Amino acid sequence: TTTVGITLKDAVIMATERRVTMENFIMHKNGKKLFQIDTYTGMTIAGLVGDAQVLVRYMKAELELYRLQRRVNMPIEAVATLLSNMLNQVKYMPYMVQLLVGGIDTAPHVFSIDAAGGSVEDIYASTGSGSPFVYGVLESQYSEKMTVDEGVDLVIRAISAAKQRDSASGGMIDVAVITRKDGYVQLPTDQIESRIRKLGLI
Amino acid sequence: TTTVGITLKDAVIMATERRVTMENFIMHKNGKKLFQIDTYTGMTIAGLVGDAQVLVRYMKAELELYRLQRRVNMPIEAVATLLSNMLNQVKYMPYMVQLLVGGIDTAPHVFSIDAAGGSVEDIYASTGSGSPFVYGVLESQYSEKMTVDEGVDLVIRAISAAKQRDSASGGMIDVAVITRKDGYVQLPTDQIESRIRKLGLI
Amino acid sequence: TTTVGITLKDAVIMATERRVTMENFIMHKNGKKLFQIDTYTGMTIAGLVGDAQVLVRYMKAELELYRLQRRVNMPIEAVATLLSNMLNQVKYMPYMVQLLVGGIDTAPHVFSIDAAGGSVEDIYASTGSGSPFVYGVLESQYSEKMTVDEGVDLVIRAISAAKQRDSASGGMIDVAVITRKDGYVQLPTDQIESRIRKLGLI
Amino acid sequence: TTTVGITLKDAVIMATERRVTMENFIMHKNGKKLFQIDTYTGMTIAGLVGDAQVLVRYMKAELELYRLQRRVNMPIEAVATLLSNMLNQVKYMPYMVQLLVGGIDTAPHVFSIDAAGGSVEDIYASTGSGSPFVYGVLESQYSEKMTVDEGVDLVIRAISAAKQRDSASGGMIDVAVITRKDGYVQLPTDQIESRIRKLGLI
Amino acid sequence: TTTVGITLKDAVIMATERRVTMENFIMHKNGKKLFQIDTYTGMTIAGLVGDAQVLVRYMKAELELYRLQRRVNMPIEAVATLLSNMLNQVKYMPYMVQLLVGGIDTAPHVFSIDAAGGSVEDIYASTGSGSPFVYGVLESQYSEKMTVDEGVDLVIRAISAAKQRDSASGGMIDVAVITRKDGYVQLPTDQIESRIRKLGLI
Amino acid sequence: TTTVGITLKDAVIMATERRVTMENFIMHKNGKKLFQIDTYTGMTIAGLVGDAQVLVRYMKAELELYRLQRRVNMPIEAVATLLSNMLNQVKYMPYMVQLLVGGIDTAPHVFSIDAAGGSVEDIYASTGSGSPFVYGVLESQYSEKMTVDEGVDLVIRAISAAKQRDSASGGMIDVAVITRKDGYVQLPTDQIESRIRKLGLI
Amino acid sequence: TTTVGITLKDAVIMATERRVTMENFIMHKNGKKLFQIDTYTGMTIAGLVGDAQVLVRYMKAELELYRLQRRVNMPIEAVATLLSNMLNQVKYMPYMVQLLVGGIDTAPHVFSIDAAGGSVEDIYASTGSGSPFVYGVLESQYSEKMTVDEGVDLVIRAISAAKQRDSASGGMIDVAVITRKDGYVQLPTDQIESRIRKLGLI
Amino acid sequence: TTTVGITLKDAVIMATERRVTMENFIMHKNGKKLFQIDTYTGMTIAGLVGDAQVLVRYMKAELELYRLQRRVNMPIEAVATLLSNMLNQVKYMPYMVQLLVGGIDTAPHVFSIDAAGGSVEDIYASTGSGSPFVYGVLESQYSEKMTVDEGVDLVIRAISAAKQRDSASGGMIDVAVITRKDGYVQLPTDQIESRIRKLGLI
Amino acid sequence: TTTVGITLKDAVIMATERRVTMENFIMHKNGKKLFQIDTYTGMTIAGLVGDAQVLVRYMKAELELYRLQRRVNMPIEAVATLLSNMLNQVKYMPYMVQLLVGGIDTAPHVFSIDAAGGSVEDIYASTGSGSPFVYGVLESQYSEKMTVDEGVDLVIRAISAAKQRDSASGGMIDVAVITRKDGYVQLPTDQIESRIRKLGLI
Amino acid sequence: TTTVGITLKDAVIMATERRVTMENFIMHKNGKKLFQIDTYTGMTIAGLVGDAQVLVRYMKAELELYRLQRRVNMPIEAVATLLSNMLNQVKYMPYMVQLLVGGIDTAPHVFSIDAAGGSVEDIYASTGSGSPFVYGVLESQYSEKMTVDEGVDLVIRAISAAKQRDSASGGMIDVAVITRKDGYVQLPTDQIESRIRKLGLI
């Protein structure tokens, strides 16, 4: 599993791969690991599939109820704090997951949450077995002045490198871009393939 | 145990073998592993017999009550989600089962569910100790343009190969075909034997 | 790791992939797992790299000395028996390897040898984590009447299927053909790529 | 694995199946478990393949050297005693095998030898995971007045029953008949198939 | 312990032995392992004596209350399903028993139930440490066209063979015959002894 | 296993049963547990068959060589002392056996030897899993004034009681009588059967 | 500890010894192990003293309340069934006891109950570490035609033999005789001593 | 620890950092991990310091003696094979090291050797806890057409990224360039600092 | 992690670094470990991030509610006592944290609280893996007569030394000064950088 | 235990404390941990007293023999290499020690050697349980331009700080100064006390 989320001037970019390893072999090639949980919020999942899918359903319900009652979207840091409390309350019988939460309330935010409920905000983060390979690419190439198009190419290259070295990662890359003007937009598969061909990664 | 489920243009095909290994020997040669749980839904079971049989009874009750209350059949993805919640709620005292759910609501669907409640949709899937042999046959021979007759021959060949290499699998092959026009139809035993003789697998 | 060896009327075909998993990641993409150990004999290796490489050097030395002293090539069954004795003598501090030996002395032969020194002759065999996927392809498609060209396509398809489902397998496929008329011939990489394109496996 | 040996008035009949379970699946369907070790002596093997094959080679060498030095064949009880000493000398690092030795010196004999070197003579015996099913057939149907033809049918039925209930057993049945007049004679495969069809076991 | 149950055209035959091994010796020679639990239903027990006896009392109470309330006898498959639920509900603190249930509702039925609640219907079944010896006799001699008298002789021979090879089994054989015309009939001891003498088993 | 040895005025009586439990079932019904190791000396064995048979061969060789060199039979206490040294020298890798040695040099003697080399002389002794049942019979019925005929009946009754309560014991009873006048005499099987019928033990 | 109970034509005889081993030495020489729990019912105890004494008090209360409410004494089999339920309900936190229950309702009965609640009726039974020695005496000497006086001598001899071979048993023997005509009668100590002197057991 | 070695058209570049973690803290900031072992050969070390330093001394002695005896430098693959044998001979009491060997004999070579003696040639490789971060940089930026100057900048960036994410890595970067024309040349520290300032890594 | 708190005549100074080690690498470089929990109270955290963040939220809620109800700020020792009770109440399922609490009520105070609820007041204290290096600096250089400016330089030097020797510590240093006149004041980052340059620590 | 060694322009300074903790209490207050092993070489010891004292005797013998044979003092790096080989040769049954070696051959040197034989040269080093406190003092106060007098005061302050925080350290401080002009000079105790009083450390 390889997930990544980065922040730009007025945008958040999140991306994952699709390989699922069930019973010690590659049983599924097109799993879903990137989800929209609010109007301007997304989340990626890594770890136990069952625990992660339950948490995604919980967050969608909590955020939708929050929006209907208080008439506004929950702030991104409040989303991370809610997840932090939920995971820490069962720390001794925990969800075996690694989570990334990103979105726009008044500025871009990306949060990393561990199984014990620790939440840390960062300019970029990566989770899964392929994360160390992603961090190598981001350390040498990430720039805070990048445009959205340059940021999309950056995450594609980082995940492509992880797939070359992590056997638990593979499949098509899913990319989502979150902005205030356009909201949560998942890039089409053909556009991702076009960028891969232009970058010479196939 | 060997179970398999595939999707076609307008059909779902599921098939299992019948061998049951109780007390470390072959005690039963004609066990039942393929069940109809709704008008257009079927399910296969692998793992502990006691846990699997209880889950089959639960799903039949839930789906029938759902149909009577809401006047329509439960969607296939909703069936998988319900099973996902049930298994995950007892993950630390879990049902030691592997499940496949397939059916037609508006399009063919096949779902794979593990003991921890992880549910992944796929074009085809296989469970049990004989599954890796089935995946080899499906990887080299499956086609999305296959007809129903060609699909039935495909699953028969895949299970036959598994029986040749997995000692935990054996017995007669049971095959079911699910379509909107004809509903859940379990193929007669004589028809299966005729296809086996035509394919030269005996 | 995925290795395979098959016998035909007057030929032996052996093939492997190249992925090496050192320190729990994909460190090497072009490892060597298929070796020529005599004029008409080849061997594939699976398991611990260090143990396997030492055994390859031992077999090359033993077979070359055997040829120089007795003026003839060692029979294939004698090669397997020699390996069987070597592995069994250290069974409690064993080489953690799986071996296939194939060649021509008066007829095609393929032998499978385990870490405890058990040697069994078979018409075809496969070793490594990807072997069960190969056995599924071979069970449904292998024929004793196949030509050499058909046999080469068969092993390529079988290994390609294994690479799609076994994360420990990957990389370019190496194929060798052994005949009395032509000896040990390793197929060129471009020819393998041409067959892959013709089979629609890329 | 299923092996059996019985004694008659002037004959010894030994029979095995051929299935070999290497790496927890059925890797070989035509393994060899019945061996001729002297002019009027045979042996069956069950357990670890590597240990069993080494012992077969040792016994062939010891018995042939014994015949050349003392000009006569080693008595059957002496063969069992030699094996008993060899296994007991390494009882704490033992051969993980179960052995049957049968032959004619002046009268029929069948010996059962365990991994610790215990040797017991009996009118009939069976080894392997399928042995308890064989003992059920022999207890109800064996007779000391049976002819050679009746004895061959008896062992075929006993092994056939074991194959129906023991997943570790399978494949073609090999049968050998030992008499003073004709020596060690392994029955042809076609003759075994004819008896199977006549007995209605296929 | 050795229990067996078989089905015929219009009859069910169940039989057990009587040896009870309490404190690692033969403390009781005339234990009871075959019980009538309904008008046309019987049950055999194997495993822990305390757990088995409690279950027998529970089943007698449940079936008698069922008959009084719904005015008809519980169907045999319903009896097995009720036992399946009871055992599975305590699977992690289970009854350490093996159960056979047989009877007539509209046709003969025999069910095998394990400690985890798995229930499988079969034409014949056997439980206890002596079961593999029984399966050998049944595999070679059982016929679906047998008469009641022939079936009684069959189960007597099968249990007699088990007593010759299983030290945990012994004592007098108890046999019950269930038919629609005559109900649950336990054969007298003298009749069993007469059949044993006629079969030459003493 | 049940062995017994008693002393009288001018005689030693030793007796065993024949059941051998190999692989957790009754594999052999006619094992040999009573051996003549010298002109006026016998020995019984209990425990691991392989260890016991090796010790019997060692004692026969040592005693025969002793007789040829020193021209007289080894005294019974000297036989026990030799066994005591042999077993104690390997106490941390011991023979897992229980031994009884009895004979006549100038007076009757019976010695009990354990796996650690402890040797104790006694008027009577019993070894094996059935020994406590034998001791009950001997405590209530043994008399030092008994004749040889009365002593033979005593050991037959004691072993018969053990067979009724110890599942590891069974089969025909072998009895040997040692006297100075007649030497080592093994009673014929028909004579044992006659005594059993006269005692009402069948 | 040594307890015994036997049945005769119209009587039940129960007997125990008195030695109690607390803190790994003989702390008490005159413990009580035989109790009257009803007008025609007795019980013996073996195992943990604390658990056994609590059960004796429970049974006295239950049986006395039963007699007052239903105006008749509880049947002996009903007493055993009540104990069976009580012990089985706490099988995973059990009473570490072995129990014998004997008495007269319409015929003599003796029941043996283990710690898991298994209850088996038998003509005679014995519990405790000295039981195997008692079974040896009973197997060779018990007769169903014995008188009460002969039965009392039988149990005295059996317990005396156990005291000679079991270090955990010792002390004075307590004997009770239960008949319909005379009820529960505990024999006086002087009468027991007189029988011991007459039998030559001191 | 972070080590890296890459191959170019006519050059080999190897580089390490200097941090040593002794007793769970940073005790040494200027450790030595890159060594010249021959005229055109270098080696990097990772793992246990004591084991690594001993191996470096062994290799220097072996290669110098080899050069003096055979008058030529040992080929790079021969160096790796010698190390492979040394490590595998003690695999059960192994050197806990990870090694890279690079040099020029007729063409550039880089070999990776593990603790068990497995040796694999590759175009580039990295060892130590910081290796996955290096592989991310190399996967996205390495080119086989790079010049020596571009290659030096590449390894500096890769190690700098590792130091930002691996707490076990740090300190000054040491770089060596091996060519046929100039031999083994270790770059001066000031030149490395100049490149770091030019790359904006400080 | 490195945290420090010191007391002066009329001030409290607390300082931390920012490195967070999640999944055994440096995932976050700008974590937050210093918090204001009241008008004149601060707290530092070390250990499990999830547990620490939950405790910070609890303390902010408790102290704010305390201020609103009792109209005054909670005394510093009362803050430590409240934390002491909370941690000790769950000592067997504890928060895996190390805490420092400092502030002004009528005089400077610094409290150290462990995971078991032990609270000790001290003139200065340090927590985390880098604490022993800080204590070395404080032991040799701390003075109770220091000014606020001198105290700020002292904590900067102490943390800088810890970062040079503790791999778990790193990043920018955050410093807060608490006085009655000015309240809780967190020093700006540029001011910290200016002091670092003036002290020659970069 | 606290030991320290530093290098200056033309001098080496080594210092230790004297507390020895034998049987979990302070048994000795004046242990010796600083030794002269050559004309210009010293060594400090930490860890197991028995192992350390043996190594000191070995080094004195080796260095004195080296000086007599080769007529010159062994170089400091050669001393460390010799110790490195000795410790690594017994790494699996190692000396549980931490060692510092310092001296002058042509320039000052200080080497740190661990139990596995790893040797690293450094400008300064410290061993023992009090070492982290020393490193804090050295990081903030050590200067390469210090005079000998300033260096002596530095090590005294560093060890004094360690004694205030490490319970395993205590007692009088021993200091040695090594120069080419004056050789190995151990400072008198009164001079150390004078410096302690001047520094205000008492």
mmCIF file of C-alpha atoms in Angstrom, chain C residues 20 22-23 25-32 48-55 57-58 90 92-96, chain H residues 81 84-85 88-89 91-92 98 100 112-114 116-122 124-127 131-132 135 139:
data_model
loop_
_atom_site.group_PDB
_atom_site.id
_atom_site.type_symbol
_atom_site.label_atom_id
_atom_site.label_comp_id
_atom_site.label_asym_id
_atom_site.label_seq_id
_atom_site.Cartn_x
_atom_site.Cartn_y
_atom_site.Cartn_z
ATOM 1 C CA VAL C 20 15.066 -10.934 -5.759
ATOM 2 C CA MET C 22 16.479 -8.931 -0.041
ATOM 3 C CA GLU C 23 15.617 -7.072 3.325
ATOM 4 C CA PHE C 25 11.706 -5.011 -0.447
ATOM 5 C CA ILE C 26 12.519 -5.467 -4.151
ATOM 6 C CA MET C 27 16.262 -4.801 -4.101
ATOM 7 C CA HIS C 28 17.197 -6.560 -7.362
ATOM 8 C CA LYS C 29 15.145 -6.810 -10.558
ATOM 9 C CA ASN C 30 17.565 -8.897 -12.673
ATOM 10 C CA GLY C 31 18.695 -11.791 -10.513
ATOM 11 C CA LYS C 32 19.876 -15.048 -12.060
ATOM 12 C CA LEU C 48 17.866 -18.613 0.207
ATOM 13 C CA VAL C 49 20.158 -16.952 -2.338
ATOM 14 C CA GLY C 50 23.376 -17.718 -0.464
ATOM 15 C CA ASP C 51 22.661 -21.432 -0.083
ATOM 16 C CA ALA C 52 21.495 -21.755 -3.692
ATOM 17 C CA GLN C 53 24.560 -20.049 -5.185
ATOM 18 C CA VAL C 54 26.934 -22.282 -3.204
ATOM 19 C CA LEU C 55 25.124 -25.399 -4.447
ATOM 20 C CA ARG C 57 29.117 -23.853 -7.763
ATOM 21 C CA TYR C 58 29.393 -27.294 -6.146
ATOM 22 C CA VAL C 90 22.900 -31.978 6.545
ATOM 23 C CA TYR C 92 19.195 -30.867 10.504
ATOM 24 C CA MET C 93 21.321 -27.890 9.368
ATOM 25 C CA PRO C 94 19.945 -27.829 5.844
ATOM 26 C CA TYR C 95 20.178 -25.750 2.709
ATOM 27 C CA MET C 96 16.894 -23.812 2.591
ATOM 28 C CA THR H 81 32.382 -14.777 -4.853
ATOM 29 C CA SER H 84 30.004 -15.049 -0.649
ATOM 30 C CA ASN H 85 31.819 -18.239 0.362
ATOM 31 C CA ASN H 88 27.898 -18.659 3.833
ATOM 32 C CA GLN H 89 30.366 -20.969 5.601
ATOM 33 C CA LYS H 91 25.630 -18.757 8.060
ATOM 34 C CA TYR H 92 24.367 -20.136 11.387
ATOM 35 C CA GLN H 98 25.457 -5.767 4.648
ATOM 36 C CA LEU H 100 28.601 -3.459 -1.289
ATOM 37 C CA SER H 112 25.421 -6.493 -3.135
ATOM 38 C CA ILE H 113 26.199 -9.201 -0.569
ATOM 39 C CA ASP H 114 23.992 -10.163 2.379
ATOM 40 C CA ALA H 116 24.025 -15.350 4.261
ATOM 41 C CA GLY H 117 26.445 -15.033 1.335
ATOM 42 C CA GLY H 118 23.977 -14.140 -1.414
ATOM 43 C CA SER H 119 25.656 -11.970 -4.053
ATOM 44 C CA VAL H 120 23.745 -10.127 -6.792
ATOM 45 C CA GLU H 121 25.174 -7.748 -9.387
ATOM 46 C CA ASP H 122 23.169 -4.606 -10.120
ATOM 47 C CA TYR H 124 23.076 0.469 -8.484
ATOM 48 C CA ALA H 125 22.433 -0.591 -4.901
ATOM 49 C CA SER H 126 22.060 0.842 -1.408
ATOM 50 C CA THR H 127 22.406 -0.639 2.079
ATOM 51 C CA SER H 131 18.531 2.684 1.845
ATOM 52 C CA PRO H 132 14.770 2.859 0.994
ATOM 53 C CA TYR H 135 16.122 3.956 -3.773
ATOM 54 C CA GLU H 139 14.381 5.316 -9.181
#
